[PDB]
Amino acid sequence: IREILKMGDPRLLRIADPVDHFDTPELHELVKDMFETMHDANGAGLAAPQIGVNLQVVIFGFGPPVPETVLINPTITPVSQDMEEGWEGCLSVPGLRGAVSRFSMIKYHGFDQYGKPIDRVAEGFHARVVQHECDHLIGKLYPMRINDFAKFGFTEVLFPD
């Protein structure tokens, strides 16, 4: 379990490099380390830059249910311009929550750690999670996406139950 970087660390602001070689022991190790870190923190997702690794690798999936997924070198294409506001938190921004507008429906493409292609359509929370994780790959944390800072604050204050 690697330490999760916190907002303020310049490494969270970088644009991640694509993975060049699949099905390698080092990539398998990266994925294993990420799942260990994510599960330990009870996260719904994790991006490699969050543990200081500048590669386009994200994982996500939790039992609404989101499929357990390793997504590498991703691209996201919105199906429509419809957007929806939802509450987000981030392991790199502990103690806070913010309302973030995301696309309601997306197609996304990428590869697993064996280099097998992934092509999916997602909506709602699933789509939100993928957008949130992929944002980390271009050096974005959700406060960069917040438009209404009345809807940003400490979890304990926003949700006292």
Q: What angle do CA 113, 102, 118 make, to 5 degrees?
A: 20
Using CB under 6 A, which of the segments 45-53, 71-79, 111-119, 146-154 binds ligand BB2? 45-53
28: Cα within 13 Å, side-chain hemisphere = 4
Cα distance between residue 145 and residue 20, in whole Å? 29
Q: What angle do CA 55, 76, 63 make, to 5 degrees?
A: 80
Residues 89-118 that bind Fe ion (CB under 5 A): 90
Residues 6+ apart with CB under 8 A from 67: 61, 126
**Exactly one of 91, 99, 105, 127 binds ligand BB2 (CB under 6 A); which one?**
91
Q: Is 156 an interacting residue with respect to its own copies (CB under 8 A)? A: yes
Q: Which does 66 bind (CB under 5 to 8 A by kind): its own copies, ligand BB2, Fe ion, none?
A: none
Residues 19-58 that bind Mg ion (CB under 5 A): 20
CB of 80 to Fe ion, least distance (A): 24
3 is a catalytic site residue: no
Binding residues for Fe ion, rule CB under 5 A, total 1
Cα distance between residue 83 and residue 60, in whole Å? 21
Q: Is 161 an interacting residue with respect to Mg ion (CB under 5 A)? A: no
Binding-site residues sit at 20, 90, 132, 136
Active site residues: 133
